[PDB]
Amino acid sequence: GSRRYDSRTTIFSPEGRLYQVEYALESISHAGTAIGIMASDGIVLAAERKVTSTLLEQDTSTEKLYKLNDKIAVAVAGLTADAEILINTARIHAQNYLKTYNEDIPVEILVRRLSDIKQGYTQHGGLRPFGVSFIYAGYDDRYGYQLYTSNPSGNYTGWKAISVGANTSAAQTLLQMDYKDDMKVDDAIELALKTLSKTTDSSALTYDRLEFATIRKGANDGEVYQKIFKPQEIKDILVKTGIT
Amino acid sequence: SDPSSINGGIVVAMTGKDCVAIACDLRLGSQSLGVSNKFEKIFHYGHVFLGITGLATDVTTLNEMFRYKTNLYKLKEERAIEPETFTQLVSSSLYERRFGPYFVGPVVAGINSKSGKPFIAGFDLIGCIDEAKDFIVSGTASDQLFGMCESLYEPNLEPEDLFETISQALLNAADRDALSGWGAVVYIIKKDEVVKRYLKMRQD
Amino acid sequence: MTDRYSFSLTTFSPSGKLGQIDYALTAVKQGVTSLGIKATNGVVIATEKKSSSPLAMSETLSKVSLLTPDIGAVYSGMGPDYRVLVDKSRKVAHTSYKRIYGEYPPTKLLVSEVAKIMQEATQSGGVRPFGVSLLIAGHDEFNGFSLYQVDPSGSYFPWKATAIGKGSVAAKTFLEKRWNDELELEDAIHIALLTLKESVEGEFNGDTIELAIIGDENPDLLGYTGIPTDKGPRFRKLTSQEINDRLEAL
Amino acid sequence: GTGYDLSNSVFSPDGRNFQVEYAVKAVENGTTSIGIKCNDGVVFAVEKLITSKLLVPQKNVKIQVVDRHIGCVYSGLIPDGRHLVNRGREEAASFKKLYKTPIPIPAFADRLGQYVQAHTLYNSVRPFGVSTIFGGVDKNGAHLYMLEPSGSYWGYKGAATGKGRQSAKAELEKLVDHHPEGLSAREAVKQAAKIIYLAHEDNKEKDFELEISWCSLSETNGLHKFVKGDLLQEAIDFAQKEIN
Amino acid sequence: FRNNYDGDTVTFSPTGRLFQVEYALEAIKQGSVTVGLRSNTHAVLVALKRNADELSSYQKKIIKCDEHMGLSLAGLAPDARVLSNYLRQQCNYSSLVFNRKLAVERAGHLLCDKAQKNTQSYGGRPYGVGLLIIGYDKSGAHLLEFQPSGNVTELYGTAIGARSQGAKTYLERTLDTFIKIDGNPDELIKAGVEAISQSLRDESLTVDNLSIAIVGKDTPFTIYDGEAVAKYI
Amino acid sequence: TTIVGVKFNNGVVIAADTRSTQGPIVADKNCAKLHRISPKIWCAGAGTAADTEAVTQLIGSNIELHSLYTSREPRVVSALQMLKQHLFKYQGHIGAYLIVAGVDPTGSHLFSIHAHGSTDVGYYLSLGSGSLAAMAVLESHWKQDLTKEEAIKLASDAIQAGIWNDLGSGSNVDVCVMEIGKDAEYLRNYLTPNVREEKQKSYKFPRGTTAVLKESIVNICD
Amino acid sequence: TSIMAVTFKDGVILGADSRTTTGAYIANRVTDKLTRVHDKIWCCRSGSAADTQAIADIVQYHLELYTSQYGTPSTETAASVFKELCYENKDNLTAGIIVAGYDDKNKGEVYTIPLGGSVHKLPYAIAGSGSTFIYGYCDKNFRENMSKEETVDFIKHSLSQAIKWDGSSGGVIRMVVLTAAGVERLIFYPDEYEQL
Amino acid sequence: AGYDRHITIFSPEGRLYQVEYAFKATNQTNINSLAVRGKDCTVVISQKKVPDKLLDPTTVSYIFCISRTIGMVVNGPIPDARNAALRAKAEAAEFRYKYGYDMPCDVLAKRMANLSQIYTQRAYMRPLGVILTFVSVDEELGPSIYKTDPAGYYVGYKATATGPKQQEITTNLENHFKKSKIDHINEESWEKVVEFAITHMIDALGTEFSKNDLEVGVATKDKFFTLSAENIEERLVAIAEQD
Ligand SMILES: *C(=O)[C@]1([C@@H](O)[C@@H]2C=CCCC2)NC(=O)[C@H](CCO)[C@]1(C)O
């Protein structure tokens, strides 16, 4: 029969752990590091591009920062292709919500739905889980700025500052060292770059190896704006923050 | 009986010199009973405008559907949808319900952001596209609108002039239609700016 | 009967590797070299026609395929897998885009579609990943020219120039030396021919080489006249003769 | 490595399908049965081992008819044989229903062939544990066939399978040589009764019961009928006589 | 060897054997003995009912499928229930649609085919029960032996279950005798009880331990248990 | 509607009027009834506009995919087979009445398909309410071995019979010529015999004529 | 419509008018109602043009796959495939079909499949609105084993009468000759058959 | 782990053993075949071997009539060959019904190759242990030979050979074409093309053939047919009166 070749991707270990989830997490740990920092007036998403070449087109590239909504974005750590599958269904869920209630979807509701999808691949179906971890940066009029994280297990949590991917241990300790509740978006942007800068497995931290985004409520307006920095924009902020 | 004669309403779009205008009445009734004088039939996704006449529930549904689709479009294409492309999206979306159609009369208006060329188009309830260079009419007073437009209209009118024309076409057609009126709104569209003006008309 | 293989054939190993993706990539490595170079006014993709026999008719086998009139693809790895990927790509360009918006999809989106098809063969029940890496070149009004690579995992990335397969490491290095952002299409074609020569063991001519470009519209390749807005496909496969003419100026 | 013989549709390094081959062993371990093509028909005969005196004589019929002009006999797992005949019957009814005319032997043979071959395509099914000798008369002549567990089949002048297939084949080859002009239905019936008695030596330990059937354009009108009474006994004797 | 080829019914061993089927056959041998024999006017089923404790009942081993047909089981009782229930429907179908009583030979063919499907496909399992079917149809009295392998055979008499070989040799000897017990049920039954006791060893057939069933010429298939079998102990 | 097809010595030509109606009202004075299935296989449609357009594009899409798959030029008999089997399936509910023509590796072809799925072959054909005025001209002037120019003329005159005599037809004449060895040539508005005379007066209004209640700028930028 | 198939000494001939109408309008005056479903097995179509085409197309498909596997099909087998389609879909079809074929063993054969989907083998058959007018004529003039010339004449005269009285019949008379010699296409113009 | 050799999934070397082993199965019949293109015909030769005296020689064939115009010769076990033939015939018929014209030889080839590619990718389907050589005189391409294998691969050939002694036939044919400088047998009659085919078959295999040692198929405009023992004998006689 077929049973012979079934890996059984959804069973418990004698210790009560989920093999595939643990191995997927192991996979994520080798992915470029992504960081999320929540400030009083905004949120920052920063990510290190794993592997790069002189010939890689960076102006037309995006492998870690994706817009889900006009008020929600995510940073990816893991299999890009797996991420895109989830990203697309997330984009649809947001629209369904909007069409149903004529209100943008609250950040947690969208995060919970995506995590629930992940949880599924964990309990039935016999399929491998998605080798992906997300950092969600969004805003809604009930909780304002929020920062979430979800991993292969389908579990999610909220943070003031958090990281996913490689060297999270080191990154978390550095963040837990310099983060302060009254921080400001600009302070946060700097903290993010500094943290990545000290955790990079690469020589130096150049602009061509980074993706940056912020969700701020531009005072001169009254609405929420998402800014996915352009190569030159990252190059600029890299010099200013004193990393040249 | 006729789903397109229950709520009433009209929409009309015109092309001018480097501009387009789309106007509509504000009535929503239940046969002889007037119910709302604030039912706008024009919507916009980015710089593309869409007016819908016909069964109100379908007008509302279609707008919500196109908002939904143009949002996903922008997210994937990473650019706002254009008039010509949207027109195709409308047509295929309507035909998809070929044997259980939405009882509406859509009208698209806008300026191509890259070519600056003005654009308008109309559709029947199952998607047939009508891409006129001059004007497009829709609604319970469409015969009257055809009469107004065919006479009042002339090419390359300037924004301020087209405004007067489109308004007179709308207003006088609505006054010969029992199910249209109770307010009107006109949209003057240019590459850079869009002005919306509410007109003053009879309220009977 | 009935496919009872409803479980994944690609799973995570303790180290976090996805075995089958890895193995698929290894299959790609053994494949004949193929490359793509983006110029300021076009893109060129090329590969070698490794005829498996002199009795075979190498023309009856195209490694470079037209996906849409403005997008083409080439690969390295398992030819049969590529062939069905092309059928599926051509079709998805219609079902998921042309039949909806009345126009062909932009390069990145079609690439996104192909990538999805491939990602699914990495997780769906009862299948193995595709043993190929594609290089897709195309043009669209709002993005201009572009070049993309799609791997067995479903991952894709934009390139200015790159190579895949057998001598990809060396070829990529040679491309880094000759590439600049002011290259004209003919220059890219020339660079492409040089890069491919290092990878070819035997005969090197217009009959052993397959090359296509994405450039200006070819109204002569439209098939009809009357629609001002229809100017022709930007995709064009070079003829054996066109190649040789350029080989003399090698 | 090894284990290539554990799953049904698996190719071994030498390109064989071991499960099909093991099925053949079940066939060789079965009773011997044969078929003889005559000048205007075909004859089928089989060996029926009498396990004990308790078996009601003449009751457990093994030869089966398909439609009204086809006979089928087989060696191996009897149930598998019936299964194949039930299918052949549906196959024959379908053909008649659509085309009006009863199914031609060649056409019928392939119907059985594709079905048996089908059972060597997946590991969710087991190959057929029988070799089947069948045939009849149609629009243009008589036809004899033998179908192996692999789905392989060919037209035959004479055929045998089971325990004593070698003896039988040997005897059949003699007939073929000594009768280039063709045997008659009447003769084939006797000849068949003999071949079976002879081939019974490879199982001479248990007593047996003979069973014969035929389909002759002149003797049965092209319809399949069982040899009974006088004609049967006459053939029994012809054999009992030449066995000494 | 065996261990690598007995994991499921869809696998042939190197010698052409189907172990799962053979293991199923083993469940029958572990079953209580039952006997079947017929003359030209009647057919009889004699079964030794087995009990769990001395506080338990002796599990029924005879099932009526129609007014003219029934059977005895040896092995997994649930499988007997499934197979007999299928036979009840088949008999029933024959009556309702063709107003015809189902031929015992046809019932044997249907059972053979039902059992066969569970020996060639993945996921299922062979039936683990043996059955002896008797009936009186348009061609007289009949007795059939059903094996989970799908093999069904018509006999004058036979036995299945533990130590069944005793009764079977007895019948194979008593053949010429009982086969002529026409017009006399009690004689056929006694003959059946004599054959079954040829497989005793543990105890002796008691009143709540013996189970008999008969069908024939002017006798609708009927079961006798307890007091009703006393006159045979 | 008036649509026609006319074969000539080395190809085929199809033509159509440009009026689109909603009951007795002219919704479009210059619609396009000539559709492209593939580069050299064009179609003229009558009946339900959304249907002729939708059916033409669907088969067109599949024809393109078939062409790519077979590495061959699309054949008219293929578009015909796909159209008729599609229309037959919908039992006439898809109101498409078409005149399909074109050139392919096997020559030049001219066919007609009705909503229910039946097809016809001929040297000259016409469909639509203008069908009878057009056919009257074709039956009166057609002849075998027409030159390209003669065919265009005959076809063009047939549409005119319809424009002038059929209330269901009007405005302009669109033509498409498909010749065996050349590119298909689409002649949009090959004839425009119905230009509106200058109006007697200008209705341009003096600015300020319209009473306005409220005014505001609409936000387009995100 | 007026269609007929007639068996004779050397095989069989099919004949038909060439008119298709939509009301009083003649949509096609040169229609070909004689359809090939196999080299020597053709049919005459009446009723719905759309229905009979779809049926014929499917029969041709079936006989092609039949040939690929079992060789050339008998005319009876072809009539059976037609029947299956017409009977099983009687509620949604309006098709009166005459099936005619030439076998070497069986020579010419004719099967008529009327509206309900029943099959009838006959020496000859007539169908279509126009046939009603020639029942008497055909019954008086048909003879078995006629020559090719006689048969062509019988059909030509019969159909000319059918076309004469039936407004639904007209145009030219087409015929298809099916014999061992092969397949022959005949056509007769108005000026010829009208003055018979 | 070691199961990457039982189903069609990649081995650490990126190989598909089951597809390789399926190729092994193609030579199981120990039969060799070859195909050549004439000026306006296509010929396929195939050894015919009937060992058993009890077999009806007339029913032993590895050549099939797929459609009126397409012919197909198979190298591999007969049951898998017949599976392929049935499918090919069904595909050929459906194509005509849906698209209005006869399915081209190369298209049928691509179709069958695609089906094969799938058994290569889906675990529950095993590859068929056969190589299919399709021939015809395409209305657009003229004489055509397209062959497909268990890998889902296919291509057109000027001429080709298949079986245990494939290589010897191939080099023989290669040499001939290096000499002639053209890509077909410049002969007007298929009879002579068949003769060329058999001649080179003999040279390359170093064997003589009787009328029952061969099997022949010929494709011409609008038709593909196989020769009879006698049509063959007439062929053998002709080549004899040259050597
Ligand atoms: C002609 O058939 C038709 C046209 O309005 C359409 C328009 C565009 C393409 C298909 C043809 N169709 C109709 O239904 C109209 C007549 C109704 O009596 C008209 C104008 O003839």
Ligand SMILES: *C(=O)[C@]1([C@@H](O)[C@@H]2C=CCCC2)NC(=O)[C@H](CCO)[C@]1(C)O
């Ligand atoms: C004849 O039966 C019929 C013909 O138009 C069709 C045309 C082609 C093949 C089938 C026969 N059928 C009709 O419905 C027509 C009359 C409509 O009033 C006619 C001419 O009788």
